Amino acid sequence: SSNDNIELVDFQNIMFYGDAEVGDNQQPFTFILDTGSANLWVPSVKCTTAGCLTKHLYDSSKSRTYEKDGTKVEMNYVSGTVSGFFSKDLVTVGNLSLPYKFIEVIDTNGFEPTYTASTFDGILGLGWKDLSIGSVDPIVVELKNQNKIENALFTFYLPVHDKHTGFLTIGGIEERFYEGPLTYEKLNHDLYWQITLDAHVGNIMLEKANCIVDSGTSAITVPTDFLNKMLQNLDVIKVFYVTLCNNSKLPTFEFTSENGKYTLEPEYYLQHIEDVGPGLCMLNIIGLDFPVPTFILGDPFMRKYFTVFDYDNHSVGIALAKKNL
Ligand SMILES: CC(C)C[C@H](NC(=O)[C@H](C)NC(=O)C[C@H](O)[C@H](COCc1ccc(Br)cc1)NC(=O)[C@@H](NC(=O)c1ccccn1)C(C)C)C(N)=O
């Protein structure tokens, strides 16, 4: 390989994780790798909440490269919050490292119960600068500016449960991860990796929809009216929504563009829950409303489609992911 590759591990076809290190002594952490975010945080030894107790806890006194900051910070996500302070230290992703500004989280109460139930320690954001808190240049943009990579781009080939591992790749595109053509879609905003596409489910449409490609999200989210229209006379029961996995009325998402066509079928957006019951699926689709009608294409989408996030060309590339390497 001529690129930096970091292996991704699956967690029951819902979420995936990847490891990176912080500190010149390479203390290991498990991260959500999140193109929907623009900050890096790890839980600190100074964390006082209960969630932190089983986590890998970052200790700045072990790194000669640590550089104090201390500015207080709260990190807000759609479905939780963590707080702490800024610090700077060597951050290492695959085999590339750089001095980088990140957050030492000391309070995780705003992430519970998910945090304690899950195996990740922190989050490693991979969005654009203006999405970040504390005005911090993206890791991959810095690598480029520091001449540690030649191309400011990264790709996601997601893992599938009991089939194969995945790869986050920084610095170039590897044909081995995908099949059929690679189509590029220009960002509508240098913020999230968000592009404009026409959405169609049944006889429902949203032209010029804002679509966030978000690796740190374990569902597809749609605007709530759009969801309600999708649910009409569909044989699903509002408990989050449960359906028979073979429910023949379950529609296919279509997203079209100037020069690309992408689909998402029920087999990708159904979160099998066959331990609640035999032939039983969760709709892995959530209603969520932003100022402008938005779709978040999360893990279900990125599990089907290989993706490229190119900062130099301000665009996202999309292709069918190879079913097996
Ligand atoms: C709330 C906004 C007004 C604030 C906004 N902030 C952001 O836009 C931040 C930077 N990014 C995001 O919130 C999107 C991220 O991709 C985020 C990543 O978080 C994952 C996450 C969240 C909560 C727990 Br617990 C564990 C893991 N995904 C999510 O929060 C998704 N949740 C989930 O995927 C999820 C998965 C598992 C458990 C709980 N939630 C969500 C989109 C549906 C802003 N303007 O600064």
Side-chain angles (χ1 to χ4, degrees), residues 40-47 58-60 66-69 73 82-89 102-107:
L40 179 53
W41 70 262
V42 289
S44 180
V45 283
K46 304 209 192 114
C47 187
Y58 170 77
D59 183 341
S60 56
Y66 167 66
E67 193 163 328
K68 168 157 180 51
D69 180 319
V73 69
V82 304
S83 64
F85 56 92
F86 279 122
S87 294
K88 188 178 186 160
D89 208 335
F102 66 100
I103 302 175
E104 272 186 74
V105 167
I106 64 176
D107 188 336

PDB file of all heavy atoms in Angstrom, residues 40-47 58-60 66-69 73 82-89 102-107:
ATOM      1  N   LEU A  40     -11.733  16.017  18.073  1.00  0.00           N
ATOM      2  CA  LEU A  40     -11.215  14.803  18.713  1.00  0.00           C
ATOM      3  C   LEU A  40     -11.319  14.922  20.224  1.00  0.00           C
ATOM      4  O   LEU A  40     -10.898  15.932  20.784  1.00  0.00           O
ATOM      5  CB  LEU A  40      -9.749  14.632  18.376  1.00  0.00           C
ATOM      6  CG  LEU A  40      -9.020  13.436  18.957  1.00  0.00           C
ATOM      7  CD1 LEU A  40      -9.803  12.232  18.611  1.00  0.00           C
ATOM      8  CD2 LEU A  40      -7.667  13.324  18.327  1.00  0.00           C
ATOM      9  N   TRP A  41     -11.876  13.902  20.881  1.00  0.00           N
ATOM     10  CA  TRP A  41     -11.877  13.851  22.341  1.00  0.00           C
ATOM     11  C   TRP A  41     -11.599  12.466  22.862  1.00  0.00           C
ATOM     12  O   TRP A  41     -12.008  11.491  22.256  1.00  0.00           O
ATOM     13  CB  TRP A  41     -13.161  14.433  22.931  1.00  0.00           C
ATOM     14  CG  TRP A  41     -14.442  13.663  22.745  1.00  0.00           C
ATOM     15  CD1 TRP A  41     -15.378  13.888  21.794  1.00  0.00           C
ATOM     16  CD2 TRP A  41     -14.949  12.569  23.539  1.00  0.00           C
ATOM     17  NE1 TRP A  41     -16.443  13.033  21.943  1.00  0.00           N
ATOM     18  CE2 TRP A  41     -16.207  12.227  23.021  1.00  0.00           C
ATOM     19  CE3 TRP A  41     -14.475  11.873  24.654  1.00  0.00           C
ATOM     20  CZ2 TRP A  41     -16.978  11.210  23.549  1.00  0.00           C
ATOM     21  CZ3 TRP A  41     -15.247  10.889  25.200  1.00  0.00           C
ATOM     22  CH2 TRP A  41     -16.488  10.555  24.632  1.00  0.00           C
ATOM     23  N   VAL A  42     -10.823  12.390  23.935  1.00  0.00           N
ATOM     24  CA  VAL A  42     -10.652  11.156  24.710  1.00  0.00           C
ATOM     25  C   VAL A  42     -10.964  11.406  26.180  1.00  0.00           C
ATOM     26  O   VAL A  42     -10.689  12.490  26.702  1.00  0.00           O
ATOM     27  CB  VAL A  42      -9.193  10.615  24.634  1.00  0.00           C
ATOM     28  CG1 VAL A  42      -8.917  10.073  23.271  1.00  0.00           C
ATOM     29  CG2 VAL A  42      -8.187  11.699  24.979  1.00  0.00           C
ATOM     30  N   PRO A  43     -11.493  10.411  26.878  1.00  0.00           N
ATOM     31  CA  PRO A  43     -11.768  10.571  28.309  1.00  0.00           C
ATOM     32  C   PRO A  43     -10.416  10.675  29.088  1.00  0.00           C
ATOM     33  O   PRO A  43      -9.435   9.984  28.764  1.00  0.00           O
ATOM     34  CB  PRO A  43     -12.563   9.309  28.630  1.00  0.00           C
ATOM     35  CG  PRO A  43     -12.098   8.328  27.658  1.00  0.00           C
ATOM     36  CD  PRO A  43     -11.852   9.065  26.411  1.00  0.00           C
ATOM     37  N   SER A  44     -10.364  11.556  30.077  1.00  0.00           N
ATOM     38  CA  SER A  44      -9.138  11.874  30.798  1.00  0.00           C
ATOM     39  C   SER A  44      -9.131  11.123  32.092  1.00  0.00           C
ATOM     40  O   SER A  44     -10.194  10.770  32.613  1.00  0.00           O
ATOM     41  CB  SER A  44      -9.081  13.393  31.120  1.00  0.00           C
ATOM     42  OG  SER A  44      -7.898  13.741  31.817  1.00  0.00           O
ATOM     43  N   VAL A  45      -7.928  10.899  32.624  1.00  0.00           N
ATOM     44  CA  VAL A  45      -7.792  10.386  33.992  1.00  0.00           C
ATOM     45  C   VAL A  45      -8.451  11.339  34.987  1.00  0.00           C
ATOM     46  O   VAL A  45      -8.762  10.939  36.096  1.00  0.00           O
ATOM     47  CB  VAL A  45      -6.307  10.171  34.470  1.00  0.00           C
ATOM     48  CG1 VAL A  45      -5.706   8.923  33.890  1.00  0.00           C
ATOM     49  CG2 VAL A  45      -5.413  11.415  34.208  1.00  0.00           C
ATOM     50  N   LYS A  46      -8.637  12.598  34.614  1.00  0.00           N
ATOM     51  CA  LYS A  46      -9.279  13.560  35.518  1.00  0.00           C
ATOM     52  C   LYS A  46     -10.828  13.489  35.482  1.00  0.00           C
ATOM     53  O   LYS A  46     -11.495  14.171  36.247  1.00  0.00           O
ATOM     54  CB  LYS A  46      -8.752  14.958  35.221  1.00  0.00           C
ATOM     55  CG  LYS A  46      -7.206  15.026  35.321  1.00  0.00           C
ATOM     56  CD  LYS A  46      -6.738  16.406  35.727  1.00  0.00           C
ATOM     57  CE  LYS A  46      -5.204  16.596  35.553  1.00  0.00           C
ATOM     58  NZ  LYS A  46      -4.846  17.625  34.460  1.00  0.00           N
ATOM     59  N   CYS A  47     -11.372  12.617  34.627  1.00  0.00           N
ATOM     60  CA  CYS A  47     -12.809  12.348  34.551  1.00  0.00           C
ATOM     61  C   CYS A  47     -13.345  11.839  35.880  1.00  0.00           C
ATOM     62  O   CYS A  47     -12.783  10.947  36.480  1.00  0.00           O
ATOM     63  CB  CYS A  47     -13.107  11.331  33.455  1.00  0.00           C
ATOM     64  SG  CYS A  47     -14.860  11.032  33.109  1.00  0.00           S
ATOM     65  N   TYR A  58      -6.799   8.900  29.093  1.00  0.00           N
ATOM     66  CA  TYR A  58      -5.605   9.624  28.704  1.00  0.00           C
ATOM     67  C   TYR A  58      -4.898  10.346  29.882  1.00  0.00           C
ATOM     68  O   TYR A  58      -5.527  11.077  30.647  1.00  0.00           O
ATOM     69  CB  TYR A  58      -5.959  10.632  27.619  1.00  0.00           C
ATOM     70  CG  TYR A  58      -4.865  11.596  27.314  1.00  0.00           C
ATOM     71  CD1 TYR A  58      -3.779  11.225  26.550  1.00  0.00           C
ATOM     72  CD2 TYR A  58      -4.916  12.912  27.812  1.00  0.00           C
ATOM     73  CE1 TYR A  58      -2.743  12.151  26.280  1.00  0.00           C
ATOM     74  CE2 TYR A  58      -3.904  13.844  27.544  1.00  0.00           C
ATOM     75  CZ  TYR A  58      -2.817  13.451  26.782  1.00  0.00           C
ATOM     76  OH  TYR A  58      -1.829  14.371  26.534  1.00  0.00           O
ATOM     77  N   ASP A  59      -3.582  10.149  29.996  1.00  0.00           N
ATOM     78  CA  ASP A  59      -2.788  10.718  31.100  1.00  0.00           C
ATOM     79  C   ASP A  59      -1.648  11.511  30.490  1.00  0.00           C
ATOM     80  O   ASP A  59      -0.659  10.940  30.035  1.00  0.00           O
ATOM     81  CB  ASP A  59      -2.268   9.575  32.001  1.00  0.00           C
ATOM     82  CG  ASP A  59      -1.486  10.057  33.227  1.00  0.00           C
ATOM     83  OD1 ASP A  59      -1.007  11.215  33.245  1.00  0.00           O
ATOM     84  OD2 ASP A  59      -1.285   9.317  34.224  1.00  0.00           O
ATOM     85  N   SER A  60      -1.826  12.833  30.472  1.00  0.00           N
ATOM     86  CA  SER A  60      -0.890  13.795  29.876  1.00  0.00           C
ATOM     87  C   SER A  60       0.492  13.826  30.515  1.00  0.00           C
ATOM     88  O   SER A  60       1.475  14.265  29.883  1.00  0.00           O
ATOM     89  CB  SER A  60      -1.473  15.218  29.969  1.00  0.00           C
ATOM     90  OG  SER A  60      -1.794  15.606  31.307  1.00  0.00           O
ATOM     91  N   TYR A  66       3.153  16.539  25.330  1.00  0.00           N
ATOM     92  CA  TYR A  66       1.969  17.230  25.810  1.00  0.00           C
ATOM     93  C   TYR A  66       2.230  18.697  25.914  1.00  0.00           C
ATOM     94  O   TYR A  66       3.317  19.102  26.245  1.00  0.00           O
ATOM     95  CB  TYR A  66       1.551  16.710  27.187  1.00  0.00           C
ATOM     96  CG  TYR A  66       0.515  17.556  27.943  1.00  0.00           C
ATOM     97  CD1 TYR A  66      -0.768  17.680  27.469  1.00  0.00           C
ATOM     98  CD2 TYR A  66       0.835  18.212  29.146  1.00  0.00           C
ATOM     99  CE1 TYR A  66      -1.715  18.411  28.150  1.00  0.00           C
ATOM    100  CE2 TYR A  66      -0.128  18.948  29.855  1.00  0.00           C
ATOM    101  CZ  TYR A  66      -1.399  19.050  29.339  1.00  0.00           C
ATOM    102  OH  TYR A  66      -2.397  19.748  29.980  1.00  0.00           O
ATOM    103  N   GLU A  67       1.194  19.478  25.651  1.00  0.00           N
ATOM    104  CA  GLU A  67       1.262  20.927  25.652  1.00  0.00           C
ATOM    105  C   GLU A  67      -0.046  21.408  26.202  1.00  0.00           C
ATOM    106  O   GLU A  67      -1.121  21.192  25.606  1.00  0.00           O
ATOM    107  CB  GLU A  67       1.469  21.414  24.228  1.00  0.00           C
ATOM    108  CG  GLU A  67       1.861  22.854  24.067  1.00  0.00           C
ATOM    109  CD  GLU A  67       2.444  23.123  22.680  1.00  0.00           C
ATOM    110  OE1 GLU A  67       3.098  22.202  22.086  1.00  0.00           O
ATOM    111  OE2 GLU A  67       2.240  24.267  22.182  1.00  0.00           O
ATOM    112  N   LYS A  68       0.055  22.028  27.370  1.00  0.00           N
ATOM    113  CA  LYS A  68      -1.068  22.538  28.133  1.00  0.00           C
ATOM    114  C   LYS A  68      -1.904  23.535  27.329  1.00  0.00           C
ATOM    115  O   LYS A  68      -1.393  24.246  26.457  1.00  0.00           O
ATOM    116  CB  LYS A  68      -0.515  23.186  29.421  1.00  0.00           C
ATOM    117  CG  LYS A  68      -1.512  24.047  30.237  1.00  0.00           C
ATOM    118  CD  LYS A  68      -1.121  24.208  31.757  1.00  0.00           C
ATOM    119  CE  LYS A  68      -2.142  25.081  32.549  1.00  0.00           C
ATOM    120  NZ  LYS A  68      -3.596  24.689  32.397  1.00  0.00           N
ATOM    121  N   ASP A  69      -3.196  23.593  27.636  1.00  0.00           N
ATOM    122  CA  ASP A  69      -4.086  24.611  27.077  1.00  0.00           C
ATOM    123  C   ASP A  69      -5.042  25.004  28.165  1.00  0.00           C
ATOM    124  O   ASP A  69      -4.883  26.072  28.703  1.00  0.00           O
ATOM    125  CB  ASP A  69      -4.820  24.121  25.830  1.00  0.00           C
ATOM    126  CG  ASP A  69      -5.762  25.175  25.231  1.00  0.00           C
ATOM    127  OD1 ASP A  69      -6.489  25.910  25.953  1.00  0.00           O
ATOM    128  OD2 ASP A  69      -5.868  25.320  24.002  1.00  0.00           O
ATOM    129  N   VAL A  73     -14.420  23.490  27.505  1.00  0.00           N
ATOM    130  CA  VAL A  73     -15.191  23.182  26.306  1.00  0.00           C
ATOM    131  C   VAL A  73     -16.287  22.151  26.553  1.00  0.00           C
ATOM    132  O   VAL A  73     -16.108  21.184  27.298  1.00  0.00           O
ATOM    133  CB  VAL A  73     -14.278  22.725  25.147  1.00  0.00           C
ATOM    134  CG1 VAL A  73     -13.661  21.368  25.414  1.00  0.00           C
ATOM    135  CG2 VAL A  73     -15.059  22.714  23.848  1.00  0.00           C
ATOM    136  N   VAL A  82     -20.686  15.874  26.042  1.00  0.00           N
ATOM    137  CA  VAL A  82     -19.586  15.595  26.947  1.00  0.00           C
ATOM    138  C   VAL A  82     -18.823  16.877  27.088  1.00  0.00           C
ATOM    139  O   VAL A  82     -18.801  17.679  26.164  1.00  0.00           O
ATOM    140  CB  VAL A  82     -18.614  14.489  26.432  1.00  0.00           C
ATOM    141  CG1 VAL A  82     -19.374  13.204  26.129  1.00  0.00           C
ATOM    142  CG2 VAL A  82     -17.848  14.944  25.192  1.00  0.00           C
ATOM    143  N   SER A  83     -18.185  17.076  28.239  1.00  0.00           N
ATOM    144  CA  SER A  83     -17.452  18.308  28.460  1.00  0.00           C
ATOM    145  C   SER A  83     -16.061  18.094  29.058  1.00  0.00           C
ATOM    146  O   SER A  83     -15.778  17.044  29.586  1.00  0.00           O
ATOM    147  CB  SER A  83     -18.309  19.226  29.341  1.00  0.00           C
ATOM    148  OG  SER A  83     -18.525  18.680  30.605  1.00  0.00           O
ATOM    149  N   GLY A  84     -15.206  19.122  29.000  1.00  0.00           N
ATOM    150  CA  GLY A  84     -13.870  19.036  29.544  1.00  0.00           C
ATOM    151  C   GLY A  84     -13.016  20.228  29.131  1.00  0.00           C
ATOM    152  O   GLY A  84     -13.506  21.359  29.079  1.00  0.00           O
ATOM    153  N   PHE A  85     -11.746  19.996  28.813  1.00  0.00           N
ATOM    154  CA  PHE A  85     -10.875  21.087  28.415  1.00  0.00           C
ATOM    155  C   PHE A  85      -9.976  20.731  27.266  1.00  0.00           C
ATOM    156  O   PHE A  85      -9.670  19.574  27.050  1.00  0.00           O
ATOM    157  CB  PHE A  85     -10.034  21.578  29.599  1.00  0.00           C
ATOM    158  CG  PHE A  85      -9.215  20.514  30.242  1.00  0.00           C
ATOM    159  CD1 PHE A  85      -7.927  20.288  29.824  1.00  0.00           C
ATOM    160  CD2 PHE A  85      -9.746  19.742  31.268  1.00  0.00           C
ATOM    161  CE1 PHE A  85      -7.172  19.305  30.393  1.00  0.00           C
ATOM    162  CE2 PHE A  85      -9.012  18.759  31.832  1.00  0.00           C
ATOM    163  CZ  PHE A  85      -7.714  18.523  31.394  1.00  0.00           C
ATOM    164  N   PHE A  86      -9.512  21.753  26.553  1.00  0.00           N
ATOM    165  CA  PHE A  86      -8.546  21.559  25.476  1.00  0.00           C
ATOM    166  C   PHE A  86      -7.160  21.186  25.992  1.00  0.00           C
ATOM    167  O   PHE A  86      -6.769  21.536  27.096  1.00  0.00           O
ATOM    168  CB  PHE A  86      -8.454  22.776  24.556  1.00  0.00           C
ATOM    169  CG  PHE A  86      -9.539  22.852  23.534  1.00  0.00           C
ATOM    170  CD1 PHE A  86     -10.379  23.969  23.483  1.00  0.00           C
ATOM    171  CD2 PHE A  86      -9.737  21.811  22.621  1.00  0.00           C
ATOM    172  CE1 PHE A  86     -11.401  24.041  22.567  1.00  0.00           C
ATOM    173  CE2 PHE A  86     -10.746  21.875  21.708  1.00  0.00           C
ATOM    174  CZ  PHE A  86     -11.578  22.989  21.664  1.00  0.00           C
ATOM    175  N   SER A  87      -6.452  20.437  25.145  1.00  0.00           N
ATOM    176  CA  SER A  87      -5.068  20.039  25.328  1.00  0.00           C
ATOM    177  C   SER A  87      -4.485  19.829  23.951  1.00  0.00           C
ATOM    178  O   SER A  87      -5.214  19.777  22.963  1.00  0.00           O
ATOM    179  CB  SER A  87      -4.961  18.736  26.067  1.00  0.00           C
ATOM    180  OG  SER A  87      -5.431  18.864  27.389  1.00  0.00           O
ATOM    181  N   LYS A  88      -3.162  19.747  23.892  1.00  0.00           N
ATOM    182  CA  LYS A  88      -2.470  19.424  22.654  1.00  0.00           C
ATOM    183  C   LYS A  88      -1.436  18.325  22.889  1.00  0.00           C
ATOM    184  O   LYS A  88      -0.744  18.322  23.863  1.00  0.00           O
ATOM    185  CB  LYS A  88      -1.836  20.657  22.043  1.00  0.00           C
ATOM    186  CG  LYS A  88      -1.270  20.434  20.654  1.00  0.00           C
ATOM    187  CD  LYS A  88      -0.691  21.751  20.084  1.00  0.00           C
ATOM    188  CE  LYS A  88      -0.264  21.562  18.662  1.00  0.00           C
ATOM    189  NZ  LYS A  88      -0.157  22.833  17.971  1.00  0.00           N
ATOM    190  N   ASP A  89      -1.338  17.391  21.968  1.00  0.00           N
ATOM    191  CA  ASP A  89      -0.374  16.313  22.088  1.00  0.00           C
ATOM    192  C   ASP A  89      -0.290  15.622  20.745  1.00  0.00           C
ATOM    193  O   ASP A  89      -1.120  15.845  19.873  1.00  0.00           O
ATOM    194  CB  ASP A  89      -0.831  15.317  23.161  1.00  0.00           C
ATOM    195  CG  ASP A  89       0.315  14.602  23.830  1.00  0.00           C
ATOM    196  OD1 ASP A  89       1.420  14.442  23.285  1.00  0.00           O
ATOM    197  OD2 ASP A  89       0.132  14.125  24.968  1.00  0.00           O
ATOM    198  N   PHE A 102      -6.968  18.673  20.889  1.00  0.00           N
ATOM    199  CA  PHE A 102      -8.090  17.797  21.184  1.00  0.00           C
ATOM    200  C   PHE A 102      -8.627  18.096  22.572  1.00  0.00           C
ATOM    201  O   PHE A 102      -8.092  18.946  23.282  1.00  0.00           O
ATOM    202  CB  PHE A 102      -7.625  16.324  21.128  1.00  0.00           C
ATOM    203  CG  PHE A 102      -6.657  15.975  22.193  1.00  0.00           C
ATOM    204  CD1 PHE A 102      -7.069  15.316  23.343  1.00  0.00           C
ATOM    205  CD2 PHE A 102      -5.344  16.367  22.082  1.00  0.00           C
ATOM    206  CE1 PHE A 102      -6.169  15.037  24.351  1.00  0.00           C
ATOM    207  CE2 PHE A 102      -4.448  16.078  23.072  1.00  0.00           C
ATOM    208  CZ  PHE A 102      -4.865  15.425  24.209  1.00  0.00           C
ATOM    209  N   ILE A 103      -9.677  17.375  22.960  1.00  0.00           N
ATOM    210  CA  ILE A 103     -10.395  17.618  24.192  1.00  0.00           C
ATOM    211  C   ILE A 103     -10.211  16.451  25.132  1.00  0.00           C
ATOM    212  O   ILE A 103     -10.366  15.268  24.737  1.00  0.00           O
ATOM    213  CB  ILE A 103     -11.913  17.806  23.890  1.00  0.00           C
ATOM    214  CG1 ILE A 103     -12.104  18.956  22.905  1.00  0.00           C
ATOM    215  CG2 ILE A 103     -12.732  17.997  25.150  1.00  0.00           C
ATOM    216  CD1 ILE A 103     -13.494  19.145  22.458  1.00  0.00           C
ATOM    217  N   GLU A 104      -9.904  16.801  26.388  1.00  0.00           N
ATOM    218  CA  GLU A 104      -9.854  15.869  27.500  1.00  0.00           C
ATOM    219  C   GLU A 104     -11.173  15.948  28.195  1.00  0.00           C
ATOM    220  O   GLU A 104     -11.455  16.947  28.882  1.00  0.00           O
ATOM    221  CB  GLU A 104      -8.744  16.237  28.475  1.00  0.00           C
ATOM    222  CG  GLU A 104      -7.416  15.631  28.113  1.00  0.00           C
ATOM    223  CD  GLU A 104      -6.363  15.872  29.160  1.00  0.00           C
ATOM    224  OE1 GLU A 104      -6.467  15.215  30.204  1.00  0.00           O
ATOM    225  OE2 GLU A 104      -5.436  16.690  28.907  1.00  0.00           O
ATOM    226  N   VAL A 105     -11.978  14.900  28.043  1.00  0.00           N
ATOM    227  CA  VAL A 105     -13.317  14.893  28.596  1.00  0.00           C
ATOM    228  C   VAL A 105     -13.251  14.476  30.055  1.00  0.00           C
ATOM    229  O   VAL A 105     -12.638  13.444  30.400  1.00  0.00           O
ATOM    230  CB  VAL A 105     -14.257  13.968  27.767  1.00  0.00           C
ATOM    231  CG1 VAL A 105     -15.516  13.700  28.471  1.00  0.00           C
ATOM    232  CG2 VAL A 105     -14.542  14.601  26.416  1.00  0.00           C
ATOM    233  N   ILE A 106     -13.861  15.285  30.922  1.00  0.00           N
ATOM    234  CA  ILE A 106     -13.972  14.948  32.352  1.00  0.00           C
ATOM    235  C   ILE A 106     -15.409  14.653  32.843  1.00  0.00           C
ATOM    236  O   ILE A 106     -15.595  14.186  33.979  1.00  0.00           O
ATOM    237  CB  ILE A 106     -13.305  16.036  33.199  1.00  0.00           C
ATOM    238  CG1 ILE A 106     -14.024  17.392  33.055  1.00  0.00           C
ATOM    239  CG2 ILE A 106     -11.815  16.194  32.777  1.00  0.00           C
ATOM    240  CD1 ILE A 106     -13.469  18.462  33.946  1.00  0.00           C
ATOM    241  N   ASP A 107     -16.413  14.899  31.997  1.00  0.00           N
ATOM    242  CA  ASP A 107     -17.827  14.634  32.337  1.00  0.00           C
ATOM    243  C   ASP A 107     -18.529  13.942  31.172  1.00  0.00           C
ATOM    244  O   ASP A 107     -18.622  14.509  30.093  1.00  0.00           O
ATOM    245  CB  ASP A 107     -18.517  15.945  32.610  1.00  0.00           C
ATOM    246  CG  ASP A 107     -19.920  15.787  33.161  1.00  0.00           C
ATOM    247  OD1 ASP A 107     -20.602  14.768  32.977  1.00  0.00           O
ATOM    248  OD2 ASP A 107     -20.452  16.699  33.794  1.00  0.00           O
TER     249      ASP A 107
END
